[PDB]
């Protein structure tokens, strides 16, 4: 690395809304205190259901046949 031409690059804490607070190195400065992350994103860890044939909610079949 060259001299002081690049910005400061030190470890900065990052806490999500789940059980993972990381201490990766970043130049952001102030602590992240971020939101939903890879370990808790709905991509592979929740709500895999999609709109794939849900259908109209039927309420007519509540009076007679």
């Amino acid at each position: 690395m060259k001299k002081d031409i690049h910005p400061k690059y030190e470890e900065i804490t990052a806490s999500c809304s789940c059980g993972n607070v990381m201490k990766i190195r970043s130049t952001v400065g102030h602590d992240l205190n971020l939101d939903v992350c890879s370990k808790c994103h709905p991509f592979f860890t929740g709500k895999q259901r999609d709109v794939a044939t849900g259908g109209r909610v039927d309420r007519f079949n509540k009076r007679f046949n």
Binding site: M22, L32, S38
Partner: protein, 177 residues
């Protein structure tokens, strides 16, 4: 290089028995990580180049190299030597440090993240993939930015073949389809 030191032995053990290797050096490795802020429509105002060179510096702490044209394509009316974009390349420690940030903190600021393409290999499996915004990175917020530009990330690896690179990335837990 936390992910490096943690997963190096594990991926070596996996890939050796997967591909019938006979040496430690034969396992596919990671060469570098490259990223170019391809700012083309910036001929009229040079301030876009400075904005790109600041946003890329914020994304990865370094000084982006202001690239120059070498062909002067008339389809956009450009002359060689004029600044067009800025590229940043990271090796080793910085490569690993940026890799964990692009792996872990990349989802919250992006939308419709249903995975990444599994056919982004340039024959030899170098995994060039693009993102459509910069605020995806935690370093850059939306209040301080005026324009919206993406990135052309490329994780250049030592893998001999595309399937070896894909196995490399899957062992590194990258979100494929």
């Amino acid at each position: 290089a936390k992910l490096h030191d943690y997963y190096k032995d594990e991926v070596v053990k996996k890939l050796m028995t997967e591909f019938n290797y006979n040496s430690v050096m034969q396992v596919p490795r990671v060469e570098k990580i490259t990223l170019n802020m391809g700012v083309g429509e910036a001929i009229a105002d040079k301030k876009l180049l400075d904005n790109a060179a600041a946003d890329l510096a914020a994304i990865s702490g370094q000084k982006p190299l202001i690239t120059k044209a070498r062909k002067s394509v008339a389809g956009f009316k450009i002359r060689q030597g004029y600044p067009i974009g800025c590229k940043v390349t990271l090796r080793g420690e910085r490569m690993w440090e940026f890799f964990e940030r692009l792996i872990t903190i990349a989802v919250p600021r992006i939308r419709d993240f249903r995975g990444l393409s599994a056919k982004s290999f340039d024959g030899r499996g170098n995994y060039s993939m693009g993102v459509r915004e910069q605020i995806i990175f935690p370093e850059i917020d939306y209040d301080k930015v005026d324009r919206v530009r993406g990135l052309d990330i490329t994780i250049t690896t030592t893998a001999k073949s595309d399937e070896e690179g894909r196995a490399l990335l899957a062992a590194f837990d990258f979100p494929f389809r």
